[PDB]
Amino acid sequence: MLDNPFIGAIGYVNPDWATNVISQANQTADPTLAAQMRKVATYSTAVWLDRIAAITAGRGLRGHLDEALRQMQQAGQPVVITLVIYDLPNRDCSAAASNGELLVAQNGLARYKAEFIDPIVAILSDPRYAGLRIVTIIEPDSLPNLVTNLSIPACAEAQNAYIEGIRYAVNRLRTIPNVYIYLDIAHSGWLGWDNNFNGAVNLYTQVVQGMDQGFNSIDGFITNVANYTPLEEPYLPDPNLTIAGQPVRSASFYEWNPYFDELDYALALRNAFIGRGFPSTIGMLIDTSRNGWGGCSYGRCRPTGPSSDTSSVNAYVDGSRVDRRYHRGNWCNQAGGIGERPQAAPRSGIDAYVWVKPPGESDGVSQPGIVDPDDPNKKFDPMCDPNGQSRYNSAYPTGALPNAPHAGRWFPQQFEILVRNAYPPIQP
């Protein structure tokens, strides 16, 4: 097994995603923007397995792997393909409504094992795929809920199913020598606060210790999956900097969380885990699909330096931060921009920047009353209401873009915004 599966391999390019990008480019009048979109279509994105049907629907898992083989033959070098394993029972428990098809109280764990993990493992075990590097991102929005959201019944009731399900997934995937396993661990705006950070380190250490190969059962962790938090806040590098008598982390946007960005957070987690007994061979991934924050939205353009307004900590932070969301918890259909392109080993301790969430795919439908004919499990979430307030702090708007289709479906208005706001900007 390699120390870093992203070194010496090219990323899988999903033709089904690229087809959507190119279709929009062909319908885009501005020749420069259209050319930028065509360039975007050449980049590598992860394949999401978000329900049992996803295993065989369309080209299916085998189809993507066969396509990866073709790209590998064509390129004359290894291909690394990223798969998102995302179907735990009581999935996304902190939402009032789960889009997940499996329920803990109705044989969810057992079905997760037999009908989701098992057939995935059988396909990945096919000797035909031995030449690939297969990266599996394990269950976004699962374990972090057990740190912060146990007050929510759906989360508290799912605890042991999450633990046993993730252990089962990793234990089975570890039997396949070219599978590289990264556990999802949210983002800095979720687990950055001291109590959450320590709670997460404790929890993930317990979860991994109980796996068959203990601390050797995984290859590392991933942050920022499907979120927008920047890699770096270059103009807020010191969370303890005093402005008007107070440290900048005390700003309303941060609420005393000292982690303003994903590099600080991912590297701190990695060091903490190594301190708990994980081998230094672990590496972190960060999803940079939508965290560039170029262009302008939410009443601001990207800052080009620390704010000149040192009159209050809020004025300073709000004028200095690259993440210009109204509130850090605003996760749905944000007017952000594409971030750093997928790349291997950008920093010591970081295995790669990856595009896990595929840019252009919706985070959720923007209003209730509309049922997805292909998945009646997908349900409107008020965080996606362009006219609504955040459920985490009602003083702030959701920031969600209007006219969004159901989650996973192509959202051309956001895709155009994501390309225009790319940082670094897309070059045709």
User: What Rg do the C-alpha atoms of the chain give, in angstroms?
Assistant: 21
**Contact 144/88 with Cβ under 8 angstroms?**
no
Task: Quickly list DSSP for 105-136.
Answer: GGTHHHHIIIIIIHHHHHHHT-GGGTTSEEEE
Asked if residues 7 and 74 have their Cβ atoms less than 8 Å apart, the reply is no
3 binds Ca ion (CB under 5 A): yes
Known catalytic residue at 141: yes
User: What's the min distance (Å) between Cβ of 229 and Ca ion?
Assistant: 11
CB of 281 to Ca ion, least distance (A): 4
262: contact with Ca ion by CB under 5 A: no
Nearer to Ca ion, 287 or 351 (CB): 351
For residues 291 and 339, the answer to whether their CB atoms sit within 8 Å is yes
Active-site residue identified among 141, 219, 261, 287 = 141
C-alpha to C-alpha distance for 99 and 95, rounded to whole angstroms: 9
Which of 281, 308, 310, 311 touches Ca ion (CB under 5 A)? Answer: 281
Residue 371 touches Ca ion, criterion: CB under 5 A: no
Q: Does 264 bind Ca ion (CB under 5 A)?
A: yes
| Binding region for Ca ion (CB under 5 A) out of 35-43, 173-181, 221-229, 260-268 | 260-268
Catalytic status, residue 194:
no
Establish how many alpha carbons lie within 13 A of residue 356's alpha carbon, considering only the half-sphere containing its beta carbon.
29
CA distance 372 to 365: 9
- Compose the 107-126 pattern: x for residues touching Ca ion by CB under 5 A, - for all others: -------x---x--------
- Sole binder of Ca ion in the list 139, 184, 261, 287 (CB under 5 A): 261
Smallest distance, Ca ion to C-beta of residue 280, A: 9
DSSP states along 339-355: -SPPEEEEETTEEEEEB
CA 131 – CA 133 distance, rounded (Å):
7
Positions 282 through 301 that interact with Ca ion (CB under 5 A): 283
Number of residues forming the site for Ca ion (CB under 5 A) = 7
Output the smallest distance, CB 323 to Ca ion, in A.
12
* Interface positions with Ca ion (CB under 5 A): 3, 114, 118, 261, 264, 281, 283
